[PDB]
Design a protein around this motif. Structure first.
Motif, PDB file in Angstrom:
ATOM      1  N   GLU A  86      -8.619  -2.047  -3.457  1.00 43.17           N
ATOM      2  CA  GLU A  86      -7.322  -2.772  -4.183  1.00 43.17           C
ATOM      3  C   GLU A  86      -5.996  -2.044  -3.515  1.00 43.17           C
ATOM      4  OE1 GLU A  86      -4.898  -0.668  -6.276  1.00 43.17           O
ATOM      5  OE2 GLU A  86      -3.874  -2.116  -7.249  1.00 43.17           O
ATOM      6  N   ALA A  87      -5.912  -1.323  -2.302  1.00 40.79           N
ATOM      7  CA  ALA A  87      -4.285  -0.666  -2.291  1.00 40.79           C
ATOM      8  C   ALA A  87      -3.772  -1.366  -0.445  1.00 40.79           C
ATOM      9  CB  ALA A  87      -4.783   1.413  -1.606  1.00 40.79           C
ATOM     10  N   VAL A  88      -4.550  -3.178  -0.189  1.00 38.48           N
ATOM     11  CA  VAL A  88      -4.389  -3.062   0.416  1.00 38.48           C
ATOM     12  C   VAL A  88      -3.513  -4.785   0.024  1.00 38.48           C
ATOM     13  CG1 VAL A  88      -6.549  -4.695   0.254  1.00 38.48           C
ATOM     14  CG2 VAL A  88      -5.146  -4.571   3.273  1.00 38.48           C
ATOM     15  N   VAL A  89      -3.929  -5.243  -1.025  1.00 35.97           N
ATOM     16  CA  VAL A  89      -2.927  -6.542  -1.279  1.00 35.97           C
ATOM     17  C   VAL A  89      -2.636  -5.726  -1.486  1.00 35.97           C
ATOM     18  CG1 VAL A  89      -2.653  -7.121  -3.661  1.00 35.97           C
ATOM     19  CG2 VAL A  89      -4.779  -7.269  -2.148  1.00 35.97           C
ATOM     20  N   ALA A  90      -1.463  -4.544  -2.291  1.00 35.72           N
ATOM     21  CA  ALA A  90      -0.183  -4.108  -2.502  1.00 35.72           C
ATOM     22  C   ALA A  90       0.413  -3.921  -1.003  1.00 35.72           C
ATOM     23  CB  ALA A  90      -0.423  -2.437  -2.999  1.00 35.72           C
ATOM     24  N   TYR A  91      -0.314  -3.239  -0.066  1.00 36.81           N
ATOM     25  CA  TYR A  91       0.537  -3.537   0.849  1.00 36.81           C
ATOM     26  C   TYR A  91       0.760  -5.106   1.715  1.00 36.81           C
ATOM     27  CZ  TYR A  91       1.263  -2.393   6.245  1.00 36.81           C
ATOM     28  OH  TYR A  91       2.139  -1.846   7.201  1.00 36.81           O
ATOM     29  N   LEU A  92       0.194  -6.144   1.546  1.00 34.55           N
ATOM     30  CA  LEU A  92      -0.179  -7.091   2.089  1.00 34.55           C
ATOM     31  C   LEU A  92       0.959  -8.090   1.304  1.00 34.55           C
ATOM     32  CD1 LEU A  92      -3.279  -7.808   4.157  1.00 34.55           C
ATOM     33  CD2 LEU A  92      -0.862  -6.363   5.041  1.00 34.55           C
ATOM     34  N   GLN A  93       0.616  -7.778  -0.188  1.00 38.00           N
ATOM     35  CA  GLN A  93       1.735  -8.969  -0.930  1.00 38.00           C
ATOM     36  C   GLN A  93       3.110  -9.213  -0.749  1.00 38.00           C
ATOM     37  OE1 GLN A  93      -0.623  -9.728  -2.841  1.00 38.00           O
ATOM     38  NE2 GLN A  93       0.590 -11.421  -4.072  1.00 38.00           N
ATOM     39  N   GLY A  94       3.437  -8.246   0.019  1.00 42.07           N
ATOM     40  CA  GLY A  94       5.455  -7.701  -0.029  1.00 42.07           C
ATOM     41  C   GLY A  94       5.926  -8.649   1.627  1.00 42.07           C
TER      42      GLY A  94
END
Length: 669
Positions: free
Chosen positions: A36-44
């Motif tokens: 779940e913590a790669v999505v928050a990194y690659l969303q921006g």
RNA sequence: ACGAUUGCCCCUCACGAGGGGACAGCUGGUAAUGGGAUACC
DNA sequence: AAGGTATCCCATTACCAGCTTAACTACGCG
DNA sequence: CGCGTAGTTATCGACCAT
């Protein structure tokens, strides 16, 4: 093999391809900090087009501790490579060296290849991945070729089935293995020192083991200070004694006469440019040495020192380096993994994607892919369309258009047709004269390598070669030399034969039966000259041509001319690009070039027709078509240009460029 | 009166230097091309 | 639209494979 | 403890025309 990371990306980010650095960091976060913590990194952070290209920068090795071949890493790389390339296919599939230190040692023992005292996990992994990559590459290329041939044959066979005659059934796979499983024509080893992180270059600081040539006697350079600018701002203040003094007569533009000899010589004066490279001049080679940018690369008990003036020049040219900058800042503009060339003593740095990153289109667009690309680029703004047509009378002919878009259509305003200037035409001519001169210089210097007896023998025969053949021919066949025109001799004329047949002695010696590569053709005048030239003694010819072979092999000149032609081909597409860009006044200009297969567009040599020029060598007249075709196809990747290769189907309706544009605006041929 | 240190290519030179130019490059295996020499029909 | 071929030698390209990292962590030692 | 040397571990998505 599919990856778990691909799944999450494809599942969340369908069309948001990211650059390599973000991919690496994003994988690490995923494996460590959960899915779940790669999505928050690659969303921006994402890019429309990720910079996937790093330009190269070349510097010069100053001194090493010992020759590169001695170095353990170079010996370990050589030993690993030539062992893996002589494996079969089955052994290679079951040869896994792991990426860890433990598996590296397990591998070196289970196969028996030695590492000559060198084990760096990062360094070994590079050698291992590159070697396994080359081994699979020489197998991939053949397999790809088999697939491409099958696809091409299959697709054409659809048309053959549709309305054709009975069609070719099949064709045979081309394998890239031997009968025993081994690899036929396997790749050769590469002598490249691939530097890595634990070895990366860093600013020279004086350690006693590293001893520099006598010129770098005291080298101090604070790596974090700003390296000063060399020249004073107006170089006509330097006085007589100091180096770099521009004499008075060279400041003003104009023409004048030298004191020693009288010749009218144009002097342009100081260049009125704002990005002009400045050339520096030192009093001695020691003052030059103290003004270098030295960095070291240490891998063990053997080091290497490199001079980084090359990277500074390459960085001040792209203007990615502030006017004040430190050595450590300069190094941070590039990757920490240079590629040392050990057989040429040249180190190739590259820029970090931040310092200079661009997209590099893998392929030039063609066929039905131009209209759809033009549909996209023109939706928002107008894009210039320069159409280029190569030839040999006129190297480039260009027609600039500006393809605007109306609703559901593409217009094309014809804007301006031009050819490259006389300055570049003069340089093409001067390159062809330089090539001829070099060849003549080599020939005249192979003559001097003969002993004095054979030397005189060759000199005399070459001096009288044409006269001897003429007089021998005339006396043998009775022709009067004056009755027969000599200067109007060409490669296929038949003047000798007509004079013979006017004398009408026989037809046996003249007409002949060309062996098919049954028609009867009278032998031509180029053939007569060849068969009647005075041949030089077999022993003297062997010596003379062996001397020529030696001079040619060790000649610095051929590199000069190949570089000269290449830089002249690029110079002639940069004028084209700059001219279209200053006229169309548009950000995007995309060249449209013919889809010519360059293998048959090579030129040939030419000799001026005549009897005197049958015994001279052919003046070099090769076409620049190959050069300019590659320079535009390279424009695609270096500067992210679009390129259109588009077949020019012939029509009535200046005509050559119009038709290239007309097959561009629509995919249909 | 202003502007980037080496290197590489071209040209000029009063040998002090000046002007212009390329800057995606390495390997590797193959294949074509150009030129040259020779031999033969 | 260069008569072809065959031995050699030099040079250069074209086509197509491989390449052209770094953040974080872990010890040894002055 | 700081500095020099070195080990772990992350991803790669690629066209037309015969």
């Amino acid at each position: 093999v599919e990856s778990e990371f691909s799944k999450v990306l494809k599942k969340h980010f369908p069309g948001e391809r990211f650059r390599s650095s973000y991919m690496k960091r994003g994988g690490k976060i995923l494996a460590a900090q959960g899915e779940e913590a790669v999505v928050a990194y690659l969303q921006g952070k994402s890019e429309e087009e990720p910079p996937n290209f790093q330009p190269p920068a070349k510097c010069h090795v100053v001194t090493k501790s010992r020759d590169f071949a001695e170095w353990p890493i170079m010996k370990a790389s050589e030993a690993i490579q030539r062992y893996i390339y002589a494996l079969s296919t089955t052994e290679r599939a079951a040869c896994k060296p792991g990426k860890s230190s433990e598996s590296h040692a397990a591998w070196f023992a289970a196969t028996g290849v030695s590492n000559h005292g060198y084990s760096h996990v990062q360094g070994l992994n590079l050698i291992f991945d590159h070697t396994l990559g080359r081994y699979d590459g020489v197998l991939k290329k053949v397999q790809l070729r088999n697939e491409k041939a099958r696809a091409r044959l299959e697709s054409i066979n659809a048309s053959r089935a549709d309305e054709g005659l009975p069609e070719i059934k099949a064709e045979e796979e081309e394998v890239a293995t031997n009968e025993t499983g081994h690899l036929l024509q396997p790749p050769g080893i590469n002598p490249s020192f691939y530097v890595y992180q634990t070895i990366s270059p860093q600013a020279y600081r004086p350690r006693d083991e590293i001893v520099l040539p006598p010129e770098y006697a005291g080298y101090v350079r604070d790596p974090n200070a700003p390296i000063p600018l060399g020249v004073v701002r107006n170089r006509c203040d330097i006085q007589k004694g100091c180096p770099g003094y521009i004499p008075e007569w060279q400041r003003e533009a104009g023409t004048a006469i030298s004191p020693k000899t009288g010749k009218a010589v144009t002097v342009p004066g100081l260049s009125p440019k704002k990005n002009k490279r400045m050339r520096r001049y030192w009093r001695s080679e020691k003052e030059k040495a103290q003004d270098a940018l030295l960095v070291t690369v240490r891998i063990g008990t053997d080091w290497v020192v490199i001079d980084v003036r090359g990277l500074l020049r390459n960085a001040r040219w792209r203007t990615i380096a502030p006017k004040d900058i430190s050595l450590n800042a300069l190094l941070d503009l590039f990757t920490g993994d240079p590629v040392i060339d050990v057989r040429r003593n040249i180190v190739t740095f590259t820029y970090t994607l931040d310092a200079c990153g661009t997209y590099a289109r893998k392929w030039t667009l063609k066929g039905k892919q131009t209209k759809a690309t033009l549909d996209k680029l023109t939706a928002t703004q107008t894009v210039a369309l320069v159409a280029i047509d190569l030839g040999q009378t006129n190297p480039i002919s260009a027609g600039i258009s500006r393809v605007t878009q109306e609703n559901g259509a593409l217009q094309c305003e014809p804007l301006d047709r031009f050819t490259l200037p006389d300055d570049l035409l003069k340089d093409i001519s001067a390159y062809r004269i330089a090539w001829d001169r070099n060849e003549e210089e080599l020939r005249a210097r192979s003559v001097e390598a003969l002993p004095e007896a054979q030397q005189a023998e060759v000199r005399a025969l070459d001096g009288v070669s044409k006269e001897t053949a003429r007089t021998q021919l005339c006396a043998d066949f009775g022709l009067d030399p004056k009755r027969l025109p000599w200067d109007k001799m060409s490669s296929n004329t038949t003047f000798i034969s007509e004079a013979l047949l006017s004398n009408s002695v026989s037809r046996d010696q003249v007409f002949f039966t060309p062996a098919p590569k049954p028609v009867e053709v009278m032998r031509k005048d180029r053939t007569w000259a060849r068969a009647y030239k005075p041949r030089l003694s077999v022993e003297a010819q062997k010596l003379k041509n062996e001397a020529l072979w030696a001079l040619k092999r060790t000649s610095p000149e051929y590199l000069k001319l190949s570089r000269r032609k290449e830089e002249l081909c690029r110079r002639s597409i940069n004028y084209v690009i700059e001219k279209t860009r200053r006229r169309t006044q548009c950000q995007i200009v995309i060249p449209v070039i013919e889809d010519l297969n360059v293998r048959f567009f090579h030129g040939s040599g030419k000799r001026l027709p005549g009897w005197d020029n049958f015994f001279t060598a052919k003046k070099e007249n090769r076409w620049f078509i190959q050069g300019l075709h590659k320079a535009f196809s390279d424009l695609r990747t270096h500067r992210s240009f679009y390129v259109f290769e588009v077949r020019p189907e012939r029509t009535s309706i200046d005509v050559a460029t119009h038709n290239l544009t007309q097959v561009a605006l629509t995919g249909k041929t």
